[PDB]
Symmetry: D2
Subunit: 335 residues, 4 copies
């Protein structure tokens, strides 16, 4: 009855998931798998530009890390079918490389002396349930092999959109995310894999429009909103920290006080509520998947018709990470 | 038949207006008035962080500047009633200090051996017509004393909103501007005049929500949209360059091609049209008041109802400056 | 040790934060002219130093911080604050009253010691904790905790002098931008043509004083050091380079070993190849970086380069608190 | 002078731009493996260097630039490009083939001279225009235009040597971040632990080579200079500080006057207190800043600090074009 976790892909998400797990009661990481030099991985675990110094000590040892006194095995196997997760008692694997984001690619972690459950850090395609914790994790019964923890933006959008739907009914809506730059943008103008003419531009020196998927795909999490939402992003020069705006039409007339009260009533460990006039640096490292900001709510009535704007913050890094760890722990406990 | 211009307030807007005027055929600045040390003003005219080096040479002389060989008188009088604009043949004054943004304060430039017309770089209050050039400058007949060149955001919003209105009819709409930080924000966290808890934060290190006025005040420029638009801003870490999004409902059903075609048909020297996937640095220093970006248009149809998103870029500095100079030249020529 | 803070700016607020985690020290009174609601918001939320560790509420006459009440007043003259009503022994003068005129805090029901957060002038001792705090005997009224740059430079320069003897040296600080720079190009009080420029969009040369004033802290180095700064677009976090000539021939290994031997709570030592974000919020006044040492030997002559990191905010703040606590106890 | 560009990266694109404004020079062929539509977009729109001055259209087999056709190919081996079909005399090799193996461009219907945009190795002369371009006689096949940092350092270091004699010196470049740094923390090819860090959110120490390699351009300074860099968050624009000892006693005024006397099209002189954004797009290879000079005299010994700005992009590009034109004419 301790959740032993394996991480495949020790990038930003995998490293932050490891950090977050150190502060969660019933979870621990007993194996890391990644092709990168362990000295590079240990250094990036110790020092994070936006998320601060590691809370403790990390040493490179033969075959892995010593982290806060405890040994963690680190391997460098290319294929999930060759990873002996069971040797370290791993029950559930966080698949966060980005290369196995499907059910038939990610299920390879489950084999003889492998793992028993898999959570992918991506939408994941067909036959893979998409879980935003505390919004729709009740769709898990335990029989699943591979599930998805959705995207970082989905984990921000979903509880806000669900509260609008549950209380007032959504007709349609357009999302605008004002988003930190990410690793798929160039640091200086140049060709990038995929050939997107905007991600080719210096991400820390520009406002960069970019496409999104969370709004169009919201139906995977909230079925009654399937096809009702669309959106786009503006990437801007902060290294993490983002904000999701939704402009929508509803089935009921509302006021600002009732919209804000509905969000406060929906608050929990995943969906926070604030009336403080915060800015993006204030949500770096938070453990909410989504933090509704009541100061930004607009209910615009013009000749009897209403447009409603609701806004939620998220650390696109740690907010998503905290939600992944909740889903990892819950999925592992329901077997 | 040369427009002799006086500038009161040699801040960013006044300096850029001077720069822009050097490249406009029938206009010239013969007097500058500002309380700042002329050596500071000359240095800031020569070197601009976002708008580049001055196109030519500037020298501090006794009583003013020598700019590209020609002498420009620079004085330091506190009150408009004490400025002898007529001594330098000044017909029209750009009032850009921010302290005389009303008709009874700005009309003091008009006195014996003063100026004859005034353009304020601000909304300006009652009894002051608000002019966005090439959107509503036909409301000027010549009898006016003091007029307003509107705000920088109004000059971006107005032609886009007018084209939606003229072609399709607007029911209502919500504006989001993703905006460069400005001089009313702190460089590092601290108390600021006015006590706004968000402008108190480090403007180049945060996404900062902020209130706007352009959408609510659009009726001063487009009367048939009075009260139909509202909005807000997200200030982000670029030093200039901004983008205005409008999400609206219309009186007619539309498609993306028809919205984009309507914008292209409305293009002129003030309102540009582009289908290139540009980013914010690409519009630094442009002379359009507004540059519609067809790549960002969304027409979302859900169960017969449409939400329409249209997006226009603007250099909140030089875009606004170029519009001010157009209005200055036109106002002066119609006497 | 009950502390009073005059001037709840960045330094004052961070000193309040740092004191919450140091035993035997607490702040019982804050004096500042700003609206307490603005002061409370900025204490709760800090762009570079993170959210406040705990709760802050505005109450009548002050704040409730983590359950404890803190008095907040807006008296404009130090002679008017009754520091003793709240048991305040020592005042952190951080408004920016840097004369021995900081002694107005010290009167009947006022404080009994004062620490200025700046160079303090002629008859004010300048203390960099764990470098020269032995010059305090306890009889002083007003002392100075030096500048943030001095607290970084001093232990590094002292270790060079104690081990090898410094002939002369030039400092280059690659420094975060600060509140004396404009956010966008424009006139600024004082009229410096370079601080008038957008501080987060430029490399901005700026003058310094820490190297020229080092004699106040290390007498043997008086008039031996000079330097300047390059302000660059990070909101906090800085690094001090010193190129020096010495009286002995040295090697990189020997210099690095001397630095490691001098390490303590104020002067840290690292061999990790870190960057500026990694020192945000540290409690060292100075963190020597052995990876950047250069000992260049040409025709028997040597130029020696030593480099130390500091959070120009929290490194300096931690040093102030150390000096506050120590001064109050003697 | 008809120029061929192999490698249409930042340096290649800016060289194309700069050539549009220099008479007697034009680019008639570009070779690069990237999609021409991506290359055309990046030529049109540049984050730091502004919009392209004119029009660019993708046509079959190349671009139409300001009415003139420019051939664009994607041949992966220099031996395969028929440079002479487009009248190309000299090739700017900017892909990053830095051996005398750049001579594969030179064959029957290929080019007849090559300039590498990097240090070129053993048997390749290294030219900084207006510092040592007299070492070219015309018989060379493959030459090097040195590095961007070298083109800044060289005229400043040469003027010190010619006027006063340099004993030794240490360089500190406060440098814009570059494309070899990560935008966010992560593994990078090569495994440098510091270039793995977010380049626009950090002060990042990094190694240099220009000072150690200065002998290739100024023989008298071989083995006399060393240095390092601090990468900081501006997208372009850099500044080079040199702390040196000299063979003569000097003063600030004398040093500044020597720098002014050495000024030309490559090496500029200013007394204006500028900042980094003010040198974006300049055509000087190096802009000496007299406001930052220090001459520190202690017990008869002197440390001399001289500082020069450069746009690590356009300063270097302008120098390459000068060397391209001059090499082609002799
Ligand atoms: Mg932090
Ligand atoms: Mg420019």
């Amino acid at each position: 009855m301790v959740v032993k976790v394996g991480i495949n892909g020790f990038g930003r998400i995998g490293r932050l998931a490891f950090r977050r797990i150190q502060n969660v009661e019933g979870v621990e990481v007993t194996r890391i798998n990644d092709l990168t030099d362990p000295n590079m991985l240990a250094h990036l675990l110790k020092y994070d530009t936006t998320q601060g110094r590691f809370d403790g000590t990390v040493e490179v040892k033969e075959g892995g890390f010593e982290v806060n006194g405890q040994f963690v095995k680190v391997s460098a196997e290319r294929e999930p079918a060759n990873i002996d997760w069971a040797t370290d008692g791993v029950e559930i694997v966080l698949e966060a490389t980005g290369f196995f984001a499907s059910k038939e690619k990610a299920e390879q972690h489950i084999h003889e002396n492998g793992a028993k459950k898999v959570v992918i850090t991506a939408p994941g395609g067909n036959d893979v349930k998409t879980v935003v914790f505390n919004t729709n994790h009740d769709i898990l019964d335990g029989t699943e092999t591979v599930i998805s923890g959705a995207s970082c933006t989905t984990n921000c959008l979903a509880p806000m959109a669900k509260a609008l739907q549950d209380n007032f009914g959504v007709k349609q809506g357009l999302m605008t995310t004002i988003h930190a730059y990410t690793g798929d943008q160039m640091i200086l103008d140049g060709p990038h894999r995929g050939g997107d003419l905007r991600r080719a531009r210096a991400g820390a020196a520009n406002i960069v429009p970019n496409s999104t998927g969370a709004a169009k795909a919201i139906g995977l999490v909230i079925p009654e909103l399937n096809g009702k939402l669309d959106g786009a992003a503006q990437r801007v020069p902060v290294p993490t920290g983002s904000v999701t705006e939704l402009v929508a039409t509803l089935e009921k007339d509302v006021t600002v006080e009732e919209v804000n009260a509905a969000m406060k009533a929906a608050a929990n460990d995943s969906y926070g509520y604030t009336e403080d006039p915060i800015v993006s640096s204030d949500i770096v490292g938070i453990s909410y998947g989504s933090l509704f900001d009541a100061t930004q709510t607009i209910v615009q009535t013009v000749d009897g018709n209403q447009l409603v704007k609701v806004v939620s913050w998220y650390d696109n890094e740690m907010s998503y990470t905290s939600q992944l760890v909740r889903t990892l722990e819950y999925f592992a406990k329901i077997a």
